[PDB]
Amino acid sequence: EAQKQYWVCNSSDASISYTYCDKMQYPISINVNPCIELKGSKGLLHIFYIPRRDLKQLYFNLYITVNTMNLPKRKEVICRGSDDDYSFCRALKGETVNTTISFSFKGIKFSKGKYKCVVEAISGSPEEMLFCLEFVILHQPNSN
Ligand SMILES: CCCCCCCCCCCCCC(=O)O
Ligand SMILES: CCCCCCCCCCCCCC(=O)O
Ligand SMILES: CCCCCCCCCCCCCC(=O)O
Ligand SMILES: *[C@@H]1O[C@H](CO)[C@@H](O)[C@H](O)[C@H]1NC(C)=O
Ligand SMILES: *[C@@H]1O[C@H](CO)[C@@H](O)[C@H](O)[C@H]1NC(C)=O
């Protein structure tokens, strides 16, 4: 069977999809409202996820590619110490995550072509992979 492609949304200037990278684990549902514009936009990210492991200490390595040019790794801590953490950080393996998160994307000026971001999600520390997603963000060809 062919590899499954997942579509998230189209905005006026972008088209967002992803596939599962690395080992296939539990599925995840992602929705963005309104759809992100490469130019910059804000909104709401909805995640529905039954995690493979506890979300505590959750973090992302980000490998971003900009028209075939790879950028140095980025690491983003999501679930830290004490409160102010998202309520999903206290989720344990098998416990439904069904939440909404605010986001503000600053934008890429003079955007064009195609961008990729691989999200390597690690958690449970003891650290194990949680999931790996490879997002492809196409610039709409009929828009600046
Ligand atoms: C599951 C979809 C992955 C979405 C990728 C978002 C990348 C994270 C951006 C930076 C997060 C740090 C939060 C902050 O301190 O403002
Ligand atoms: C279980 C999956 C967890 C999903 C975590 C996504 C976190 C998105 C952070 C975006 C907010 C901080 C960045 C910002 O907009 O300033
Ligand atoms: C990895 C980027 C494509 C992910 C598709 C869902 C979009 C979630 C918005 C992430 C916002 C991060 C902006 C920021 O770090 O300030
Ligand atoms: C989303 O944009 C992509 C890339 O431009 C395009 O193939 C498709 O027509 C759009 N999807 C829908 C359902 O409009
Ligand atoms: C996810 O959350 C919505 C409200 O945010 C809730 O109504 C819905 O039932 C949840 N999904 C499931 C299948 O539990």
Curated annotation (Swiss-Prot):
N-glycosylated; high-mannose. GO terms for cellular component: endosome membrane; extracellular region; lipopolysaccharide receptor complex; plasma membrane; receptor complex. SMART domains: ML (SM00737). GO terms for molecular function: coreceptor activity; lipopolysaccharide binding; lipopolysaccharide immune receptor activity; Toll-like receptor 4 binding. Glycans are attached at N10, N98. Its main location: secreted. Keywords: Disulfide bond, Glycoprotein, Immunity, Inflammatory response, Innate immunity, Secreted, Signal. Residues 103-107 are annotated as: Interaction with lipopolysaccharide. Heterogeneous homomer formed from homodimers; disulfide-linked. Belongs to the lipopolysaccharide (LPS) receptor, a multi-protein complex containing at least CD14, LY96 and TLR4. Binds to the extracellular domains of TLR2 and TLR4. Ligand binding induces interaction with TLR4 and oligomerization of the complex. Binds bacterial lipopolysaccharide (LPS). Cooperates with TLR4 in the innate immune response to bacterial lipopolysaccharide (LPS), and with TLR2 in the response to cell wall components from Gram-positive and Gram-negative bacteria. Enhances TLR4-dependent activation of NF-kappa-B. Cells expressing both LY96 and TLR4, but not TLR4 alone, respond to LPS. This is Lymphocyte antigen 96. It comes from Homo sapiens. The lineage of its organism: Eukaryota, Metazoa, Chordata, Craniata, Vertebrata. The gene is LY96.
